Write a protein that binds this ligand. Structure first.
Ligand SMILES: Nc1ncnc2c1ncn2[C@@H]1O[C@H](COP(=O)(O)OP(=O)(O)OP(=O)(O)O)[C@@H](O)[C@H]1O
Ligand SMILES: Nc1ncnc2c1ncn2[C@@H]1O[C@H](COP(=O)(O)OP(=O)(O)O)[C@@H](O)[C@H]1O
Ligand SMILES: Nc1ncnc2c1ncn2[C@@H]1O[C@H](COP(=O)(O)OP(=O)(O)O)[C@@H](O)[C@H]1O
Ligand SMILES: [Mg+2]
Ligand SMILES: [Mg+2]
Ligand SMILES: [Mg+2]
Lengths: 97, 143, 676, 194, 821
């Protein structure tokens, strides 16, 4: 179905670089991408989430283009905007249902 | 220096063992200050200026006049705190006598000057604004 | 030293420029043999004698007559290697036997011993010298480079201090055998400001040290003056007087770069900004390409452009910051107002669309020109040649916008210059790899890229390299290019072979000495045809190395990110100095609108006015991120980065999302129209 | 300090607890909801805090309310920065007999704040008559500077600024007095669990 | 369903495969314990016959599976349940041994300090006595082995013991023949007692002849020769406590001189004993006499301190504090209450017993042989560290000496115990200590009245450390109640000998520290350990090397080296630490033994100046020469110049080298020759371009032109890799002879550097010294002339072979590496 890769702070391993390339090689009917030493078959509807527990990360520009960066950081007005929806659900529970 | 109730208990067990052997004979304060000061508060102290201090306290309190009422507070000549060692009374009286010593905390109790407290309050204020500085968030968030 | 007791100097000269003649007893001044023009195609073989180069040639003969090892110490591009590489070439082959050891940082005490053991024969007993008492020169170049361990002691250097003093290298197999070495000299070529700035004073003692000074206003005028005056005596009788005028300028500009250190100085970020002889050589090489027919006549304007361009594309290329590109063009239009002094019109010979290319003449059917095309002539030829590369090789679709047009132009130029290896620095996704493959196909050359698996070894690289060196060494050979990238170099060891290929000829010990006695033999039937001396076996080996150097181009393709290039440049001297750098900037606004519009073709749009208009907003968005990305680095510490590949993957996604969205409606609307 | 680490998940329960303990039904709720949440979160943290950090944490709150301007207090950005770290500029040897050199060195820092630019020349106008008399007195935070620097007493944060510079001993009591005045139900925050 | 059947088959294979590896490994151990041990076989006849029935099966079942090799064919649920059948029965015949070993540890409680492997070996060779004795070196402080009477039948090993041998080969004869009876743990407990009996028996003979060397013809120095090191020290300290006791009794009479005469007599015996260590003696009878010096120098320092403070009363604290050793038959013996009586002389109350008093802690001397181990110098700090620990043992809690590493916390606890007589065990706690491993230590400590010092106890896992408390508490809680038999946490009913003590030597600022739970700290009376005063250690080292006025000189000495650090130009090649002191004192000692009549001041002056000059640079020569001229004010130093070697060096340098023989050059060649004559390992350091090679090369070409062919194998150490230099195993396990190491073997014999007539061979190592490279050679750099390799092949460096290191800068060098050479 999917794979979440934890840690992965910065400098993505060389074995992922072929996978990180969105390119998949079409060997007739069955699709097969070359990851690691030996190429393995690749089925559709595969997801690969990478997550980085790191305040202010630094990526090589080459990697930032190859993988889309998405910053989930609760900071300043962030929480404020969560706590409103939180409070308005508890306080005025009428006209939220 | 880590001082613990075990260190006081230890120095009681040795004091007990030394007052069971003398009995009617005069007490050996000079023997008993070394074992108190140099041995039980040797373990902790290496500085050799703190060691001179640690003994001076002990030399002051522990002598023949201790059994008569004696100002435990060092060199209170004409200050007026005068916290004494209680005379012969029931045990219960000793705990009441410690509640009778003035609630007001003075550095003058330890032999330091009043103006030693004034320095501690300044050091207290200094340690607030060094911890506030460390935790002061976002640096005002610009303007 | 003009406090010199009884024997006073003549005035009007330094103490250096005077040797004491016994027969006159005067202090005559060093006499310099005026350059005679040879037909060396490699510019590295050309050697113009100066005052400094003769008074060193003497000092090398004075340290070879004795067994006193010499060390030359001077800035990265001062021409130390050339001074020694001339002397060793001019030695007698029965007196002296010369072999260079180019240190790589990774040249350990084992690797030096293998090089020295290969050089030296076996005398009687445990002794090892040359039989017939020859002098075995082991010329170290880049003496400083060897890897400085944590403590501060370079293993190969400490070995030499065991060879000079006691003369006894412990045999690394059988570590009991003393193995005494005899009749060796060592000729160092340390540059200050690279690797271990200085080597252990415990060696520099054993050596005689000889400064090689940064390029003087006279030394430049006596070298490059002598090369052009010689090479314009050819082209035309007029347009000589332009030689000294252009060489005056190429200095004037070169000086106003070195004197403004706050703009252009070698730094941690500006590690490749090293401006020394190397550049003036491949400016004076690019003017030496003028063929008599297509230049002869009034050269007041045509030359000075060819200059402006050749200058421009060995300095602009180098530069990172656009402030530095502006500073340069001010100097370059001061130089032309003083030295060339014409300021021909209101229109400067220097301009934006100044492009000179030798393949545009070829393609049409004109013979070995290096004349300027205009952009619209370059647009027809390149577009026609991309059609010709898609049709024969594996298909590569690129746009060819003016800035990518220029890039092929100034890579086809660096491949055409024989010996000169290209170095295309740019953020991964720039299409440096794709543009090189084009540039290579434009010229009659055949690109050889190694194919790295996940499990790759130094020995398998050394069979891929050895496969290429079987194709070059046959005589009627189409000069093979060698493509390397940042990803291809998995570990830092693989570079060691590559740095020895691009430094000079071919990587020492990639064959047995039985295979190389057959490769030499295949090029004996070519040498007779050239008219070069045969059965000399010194000039034939030398002539082959010149053919291998000429028929091998080494294009490496790095990115300037996280100082991975800087640490490579530090470790291997070859990479930066020996190759003609060309930097890949992010795509201009004018380019992006074109690139977007080519991909938006084969998508429907109501009034086609939209399709242009979208492609404006597709550029603006990608230009409007780069102005926010800069705002984001200044305001907070958070680093973001965009590449031209990032943009190319937007245009794809929009095209894909627009079809999906429109196909969902075109289905939905069909149901309603069918039903109505 | 280690083991003052609080989860978002744990905080959220105390934030909602505070909303569900409000007895006020929409009259002045939004005002009385804020107040209840501050006290609730404050006590929750303090119970965990050691003796020495309890005062530090309470000042952070009232300075972060000040910083975000939830409560109206006469403060300048530069003035709060100066209070949290006093730069001591040497150069002016001219002193008074009663003033320490350190106190004076801080005043030459204080004069860089546009409000207290003339505060030096003022201190050498009626020096022993007013300021010695002030500086000497026990509890000077409730006393007034009789060279018409009265106005500073009427703005509790600017006066708190002066006290650090001249007489730092009293700061820890002056701040405690200031908390109580400026913060809503401050008297209840400072007392807490006595 | 094909896959899940295959998964169940692999699932079955994984159980039976692990069951052989569980059995085979556990069988292999229990098999080896029974194999070749007819001793252990006859002891447990029930669990050995059962085991022989499980081995004979296992060999047959293994040869019946050899037909079906593959796991798929071999694996059956029948095979699995049979192997679970053995795991259960081999668990019983390992619990049988473990329960048996515990019986023999409980019978003779020093075994608890042997590794269980060594205990199994001794029990296996119960008949072969001389193999048992070998491992008593691990158990005991001294008594390495026993001597023996060569027996009747040469096939039999000798039972009859005629003497005991120390770890330095000092012999203490037994009064009669000590036979080795049937059981091992029985004749060892019989031996453990006999040790103390002989020691005790000899002390009666010592203290009778000790009162006689006051008046009688036999002096003090000639008397010490007769007896052991332990007994000749004890008897010296017993007659000191007597002397000072007779000096207080006289000073009660009013004789002011009594304490000054006491001081005079102590200081003459000390002087007369220093004149004995100067004259050529046997190395065993050096320490027997120098251990007496370090106690006598302290004896003096106490009676000085009594005369200065004017203490004219015994039972003042000053005298109670000092560690006293009495020799009385107290007719009112309080000793039966203070501790428990163990030994027969202790209970007799007719014969005189040696008793040890200090600040209301009086405990008999527990005569455990020590065998001339070196006693530490007694400092004003160590005097207090005795009060602390003694007070702790009287207050029935442990003692925790604490301070920076290098102070010797572990060594001062050991020395107190050694003085008292008691056996002191040391444990190197490595954070691998389990509950069980520690529980066994304490049980054996508790049973055999011994003292557990724990070197780096600070690195014990806070988990197991919280148990240590529960175990220590249980023992101490028993000692307060004074129970002879006490319940431990597990294996309850155990004997407690009263004299047990615990000492945790904690490095307070060491990294990876587990802070003791407050619970545990409240059982351990801490002590404050400071780096011992440099003055006191030098004052010993001076008296070791025949200096009578050592006290005064040693104050001059500490002053020089201390000021030198502060006011000279700090160099890496300077050593002003105690290590460099010892060397300069050794070379001053050889110059005292040469000319004893000369005053001590001009001789030390000369030695200090002579050896610190060649270390010292030009800038510092002019300030250092002045600094000596401050401490030694009016002493005019004459430069001691080798008159013969200086001439032959001048001749060689000119004739057969060619170099000019400058006065300052030959002075450096003479200065190298003098360094090489005493120090095997030399550093001819200097600036890059100077005469470093030429100086050692001219020395060689004098040793050739004076003595015999001095060969030299010049390797550049940094040039070759550290692996290739010493040599290491290839991919194939075959050890290659490396450069330095094959030179070190080739030089011992058979090469060009061989020993036929070569009076001085040496390998010159002319690279920069770095810590990684030199680390492998650190063994030879030290006092030991022993080189260790990766293959564990030893190369014993000859005394006529040197290591000359030619180095520009000691920038990467460790401060120790400089001191060593
Ligand atoms: N007393 C002397 N008389 C004549 N020549 C000398 C004398 N001492 C040194 N030299 C010469 O000066 C040089 C001294 O250098 P040397 O051979 O001692 O090496 P080094 O400097 O010790 O080595 P390193 O540079 O590795 O530390 C040699 O050339 C030697 O011949
Ligand atoms: N006299 C000369 N004639 C021709 N080319 C020269 C001369 N002096 C220097 N060069 C050129 O300068 C460049 C850089 O100098 P090089 O000899 O490689 O050594 P270095 O790395 O020490 O500068 C080379 O391409 C060399 O051919
Ligand atoms: N001018 C261009 N127009 C369209 N696509 C381009 C252009 N330049 C580069 N590209 C695309 O960008 C890709 C960059 O990848 P690659 O060729 O490996 O170069 P790089 O060396 O930058 O990694 C090219 O393969 C090509 O598909
Ligand atoms: Mg070069
Ligand atoms: Mg690339
Ligand atoms: Mg040398």
């Amino acid at each position: 179905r999917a794979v979440l890769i934890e840690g992965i702070q910065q400098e993505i391993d060389a074995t992922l670089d072929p996978l990180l390339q969105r390119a998949v090689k079409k060997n007739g009917n069955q699709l097969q991408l070359e990851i690691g030493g030996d190429p393995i078959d690749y089925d559709p509807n595969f997801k690969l989430f990478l997550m980085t527990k790191l305040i202010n990360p630094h990526f090589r520009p080459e990697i930032a283009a190859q993988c889309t960066i998405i910053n989930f950081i609760v900071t300043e007005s962030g929480l404020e905007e969560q706590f409103i929806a939180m409070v308005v659900n508890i306080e005025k529970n009428e006209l939220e249902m | 220096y880590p001082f613990n109730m075990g260190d006081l208990r230890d120095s009681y067990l040795v004091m007990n063992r030394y007052m069971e052997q003398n009995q009617g004979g005069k007490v050996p304060f000079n023997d008993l200050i070394y074992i108190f000061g140099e041995i039980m508060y040797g373990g902790h102290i290496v500085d050799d200026w703190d060691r001179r201090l640690c003994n001076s306290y002990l030399f002051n309190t522990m002598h023949e006049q201790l059994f008569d009422e004696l100002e435990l507070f060092p060199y209170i000549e004409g200050k007026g705190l005068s916290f004494k060692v209680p005379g012969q009374n029931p045990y219960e009286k000793y705990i009441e006598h410690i509640e009778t010593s003035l609630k007001q905390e003075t550095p003058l109790a330890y032999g330091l000057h009043p103006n030693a407290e004034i320095g501690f309050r300044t050091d207290q204020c200094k340690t607030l604004f060094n911890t506030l500085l460390e935790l002061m968030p976002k640096e005002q968030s610009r303007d | 030293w003009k406090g010199a007791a009884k024997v006073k100097f003549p005035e009007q000269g330094l103490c250096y420029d005077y040797y004491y003649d016994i027969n006159e007893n005067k202090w005559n001044t060093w006499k310099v043999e005026d350059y005679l023009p040879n037909d060396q195609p490699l510019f590295s073989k050309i050697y113009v004698a100066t005052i400094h180069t003769t008074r060193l040639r003497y000092m090398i003969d004075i340290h070879l007559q004795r067994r006193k090892p010499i060390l030359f110490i001077g800035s990265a591009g001062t021409g130390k290697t050339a001074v020694v590489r001339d002397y060793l070439n001019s030695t007698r082959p029965e007196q002296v036997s010369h072999k260079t050891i180019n240190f790589s940082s990774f040249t350990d005490s084992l690797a030096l011993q293998k090089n020295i053991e290969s050089m030296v024969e076996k005398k009687n007993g445990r002794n090892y010298g040359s039989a017939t008492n020859k002098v075995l020169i082991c010329f170290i170049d880049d003496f400083n480079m060897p890897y400085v361990d944590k403590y501060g002691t370079q293993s190969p250097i400490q070995l030499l201090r065991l060879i000079l003093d006691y003369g006894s290298i412990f045999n690394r197999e059988q570590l009991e055998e003393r193995k005494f070495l005899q009749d060796l000299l060592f000729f160092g070529c340390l540059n200050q400001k690279s690797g271990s700035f200085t080597v252990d004073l415990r060696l520099q003692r054993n050596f005689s040290v000889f400064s090689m000074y940064t390029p003087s206003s006279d030394v430049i005028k006596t070298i490059f003056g002598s090369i052009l005056n010689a090479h314009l005596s050819t082209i035309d009788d007029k347009a000589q007087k332009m030689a000294f005028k252009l060489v005056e300028a190429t200095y004037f500009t070169f000086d106003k770069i070195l004197k403004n250190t706050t703009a252009f100085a070698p730094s941690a970020k500006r590690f490749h900004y090293q401006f020394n002889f190397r550049e003036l050589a491949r400016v004076c090489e690019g003017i030496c390409r003028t063929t008599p027919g297509q230049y002869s006549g009034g050269d007041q304007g045509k030359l000075v452009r060819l200059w402006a361009h050749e200058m421009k594309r060995t300095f602009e290329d180098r530069f990172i910051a656009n402030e530095h590109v502006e500073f340069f063009r001010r100097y370059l239009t001061e130089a032309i107002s003083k030295c060339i002094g014409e300021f021909p019109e209101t229109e400067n010979p220097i301009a934006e669309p100044l492009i000179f290319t030798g393949f545009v003449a070829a393609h049409q059917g004109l013979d070995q020109q290096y004349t300027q095309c205009t952009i619209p002539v370059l647009k027809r030829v390149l577009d026609d040649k991309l059609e010709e590369y898609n049709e024969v090789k594996a298909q590569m679709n690129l746009v060819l916008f003016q800035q990518a047009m220029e890039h092929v132009s100034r890579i086809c130029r660096i491949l055409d210059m024989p010996g000169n290896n290209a170095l295309l620095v740019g953020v991964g996704g720039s299409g440096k790899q794709s543009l090189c493959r084009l540039s290579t196909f434009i010229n009659g050359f055949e690109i050889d890229q190694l194919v790295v698996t996940a499990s790759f070894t130094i020995n398998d690289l050394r069979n891929n390299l050895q496969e290429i060196y079987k194709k070059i060494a046959k005589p009627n050979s189409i000069a093979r290019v060698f493509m390397i990238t940042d990803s291809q170099i998995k570990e830092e060891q693989f570079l060691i072979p590559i740095n020895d290929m691009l430094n000079s000829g071919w990587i020492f010990d990639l064959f047995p000495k039985e295979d190389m006695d057959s490769l030499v033999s295949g090029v004996r039937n070519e040498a007779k045809g050239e008219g070069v001396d045969v059965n000399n076996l010194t000039a034939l080996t030398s002539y082959f190395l010149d053919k291998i150097r000429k028929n091998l181009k080494v294009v490496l393709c790095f990115s300037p990110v996280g100082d991975t290039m800087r640490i490579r440049s530090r470790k291997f001297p070859g990479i930066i100095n020996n190759t003609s750098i060309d930097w890949f900037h992010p795509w201009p606004h004018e380019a992006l609108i074109d690139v977007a519009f080519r991909f938006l073709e084969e998508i429907e749009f109501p009034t086609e006015e939209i399709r242009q208009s979208i492609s404006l907003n597709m550029a603006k968005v990608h230009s409007s991120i780069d102005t926010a990305n800069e705002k984001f680095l200044k305001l907070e510490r958070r680093y973001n980065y965009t590449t031209p590949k990032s943009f190319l993957e937007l245009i794809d996604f929009y095209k894909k999302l627009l079809t999906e969205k429109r196909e969902t409606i075109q289905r939905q609307i069909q149901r309603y129209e069918m039903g109505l | 300090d280690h083991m003052y680490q609080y989860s978002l998940e744990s905080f959220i329960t105390f934030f909602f607890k505070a909303i569900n303990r409000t007895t006020v039904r929409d009259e002045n709720r939004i005002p009385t909801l804020i107040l209840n949440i501050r006290q609730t979160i404050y006590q929750w943290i303090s119970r965990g805090l050691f003796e020495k950090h309890k005062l530090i944490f309470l000042t952070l709150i009232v300075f972060r309310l000040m910083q975000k301007k939830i409560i109206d207090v006469a403060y300048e950005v530069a003035e709060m920065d100066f209070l949290i770290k006093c730069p001591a500029r040497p150069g002016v040897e001219n002193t008074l007999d009663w003033l320490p050199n350190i106190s004076w060195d801080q005043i030459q820092g204080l004069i860089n704040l546009e409000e207290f630019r003339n505060f030096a020349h003022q201190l050498e106008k009626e020096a022993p008559n007013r300021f010695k008399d002030w500086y000497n007195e026990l509890q000077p935070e409730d006393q007034k500077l009789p060279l018409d620097w009265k106005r500073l007493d009427s703005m509790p944060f600017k006066k708190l600024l002066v006290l650090r510079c001249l007489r730092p001993d009293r700061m820890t009591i002056s701040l405690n007095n200031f908390i109580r005045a400026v913060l809503p139900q401050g008297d209840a925050f400072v007392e807490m669990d006595q | 369903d094909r896959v899940e059947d295959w998964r169940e088959k692999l699932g079955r294979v994984d159980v039976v495969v692990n069951e052989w590896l569980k059995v085979q490994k556990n069988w292999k151990i229990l098999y080896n314990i029974f194999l070749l041990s007819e001793d252990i076989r006859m002891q447990l006849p029930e669990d050995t016959k059962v085991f022989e029935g499980v081995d004979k099966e296992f060999k047959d079942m293994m040869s019946e599976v050899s037909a079906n090799p593959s796991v798929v064919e071999a694996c059956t649920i029948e095979r699995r349940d049979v192997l679970v059948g053995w795991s259960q029965a081999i668990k019983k015949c390992e619990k049988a041994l473990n329960d048996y070993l515990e019986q023999k540890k409980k019978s003779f409680p020093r075994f608890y300090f042997l590794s269980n492997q060594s205990l199994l070996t001794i029990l296996s060779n119960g008949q072969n006595a001389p193999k048992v004795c070998e491992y008593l070196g691990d158990c005991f402080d001294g008594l390495k082995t026993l001597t023996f009477e060569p027996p009747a039948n040469p096939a039999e090993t000798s039972k009859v013991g005629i003497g005991m041998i120390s770890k330095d080969d000092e012999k203490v004869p037994f009064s009669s023949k000590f036979i080795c009876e049937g059981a091992v743990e029985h004749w060892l407990l019989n031996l453990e007692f006999r040790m103390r009996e002989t020691l005790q028996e000899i002390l009666e003979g010592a203290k009778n002849t000790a009162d006689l060397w006051d008046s009688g013809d036999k002096p003090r120095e000639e008397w010490v020769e007769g007896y052991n090191a332990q007994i000749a020290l004890l008897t010296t300290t017993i007659v000191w406590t007597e002397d000072v006791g007779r000096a207080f009794e006289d000073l009660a009479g009013g004789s002011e001189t009594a304490m000054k005469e006491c001081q005079k007599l102590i200081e003459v015996r000390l002087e007369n004993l220093i004149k004995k260590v100067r004259g050529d003696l046997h190395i065993l009878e050096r320490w027997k006499i120098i251990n007496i010096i370090t106690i006598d120098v302290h004896s003096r320092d106490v009676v000085e301190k009594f005369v200065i403070q004017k203490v004219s009363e015994a039972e003042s604290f000053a005298w109670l504090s000092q560690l006293k050793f009495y020799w009385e038959n107290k007719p009112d013996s309080d000793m039966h209450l203070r501790q428990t009586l163990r030994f027969p002389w202790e209970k007799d109350k007719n014969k005189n017993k040696c008793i040890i008093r200090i600040v209301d802690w009086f405990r008999f001397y527990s005569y455990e042989y020590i065998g001339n181990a070196i006693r530490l110098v007694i400092t004003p700090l160590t005097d207090r560290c005795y009060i602390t620990l003694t007070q702790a043992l009287n207050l029935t809690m442990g003692g925790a000496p604490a301070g920076p590493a290098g102070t010797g916390k572990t060594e001062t606890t050991k020395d107190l115990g050694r003085a008292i007589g008691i056996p002191v065990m040391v444990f190197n706690c490595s954070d691998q200590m389990n509950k069980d491993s520690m529980a066994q230590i304490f049980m054996g400590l508790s049973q055999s009245g011994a003292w557990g010092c724990f070197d780096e106890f600070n690195r014990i896992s806070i988990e197991v450390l919280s148990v240590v408390s529960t175990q220590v508490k249980c023992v101490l809680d028993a000692l307060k109640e004074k129970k002879t038999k006490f319940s431990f946490v597990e294996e309850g009913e155990i004997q407690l000998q009263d004299t047990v003590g615990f000492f945790i030597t904690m490095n307070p600022g060491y990294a990876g520290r587990t802070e003791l739970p407050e619970n545990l700290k409240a059982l351990f009376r801490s002590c404050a350990m400071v780096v011992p005063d440099l003055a006191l250690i030098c004052e010993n080292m001076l008296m070791s090397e025949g200096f009578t006025m050592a006290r005064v000189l040693s104050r001059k000495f500490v002053s020089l080296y201390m000021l030198s650090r502060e006011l000279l130009s700090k160099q890496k090649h300077y050593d002003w630490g105690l290590r460099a002191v010892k060397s300069v004192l050794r070379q001053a000692g050889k110059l005292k033994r040469g000319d004893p009549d000369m005053p001590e001041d001009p001789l030390l002056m000369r030695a200090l100046r002579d050896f610190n000059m060649p270390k010292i640079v030009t800038d510092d020569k002019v300030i250092f020469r002045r600094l000596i001229g401050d401490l030694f004010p009016k002493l005019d130093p004459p430069t001691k110049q080798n008159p013969e070697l200086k001439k032959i060096v001048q001749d060689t340098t000119k004739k057969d080298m060619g170099l000019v023989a400058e006065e300052l050059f030959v002075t450096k060649v003479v200065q190298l020759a003098e360094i090489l004559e005493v120090r095997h390992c030399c550093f001819v350091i200097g600036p890059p371009g100077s005469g470093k090679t030429c100086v050692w090369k001219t020395l060689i070409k004098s040793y050739i032109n004076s003595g015999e062919d001095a060969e030299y194998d010049t390797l550049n150490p940094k040039a070759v890799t550290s692996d290739e230099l010493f040599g290491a195993y290839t991919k194939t396990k075959e050890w290659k002879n490396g450069v330095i190491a094959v030179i070190m073997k080739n030089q011992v014999k058979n090469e060009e550097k061989y020993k036929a007539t070569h009076m001085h061979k040496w390998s010159v190592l002319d690279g920069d010294i770095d810590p990684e490279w030199i680390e492998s050679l650190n063994t030879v750099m030290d006092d030991n002339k022993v080189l260790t390799l990766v293959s564990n092949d030893r190369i014993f460096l000859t005394p006529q072979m040197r290591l000359i290191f030619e180095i520009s800068n000691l920038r990467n060098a460790t401060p120790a590496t400089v001191s060593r050479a």
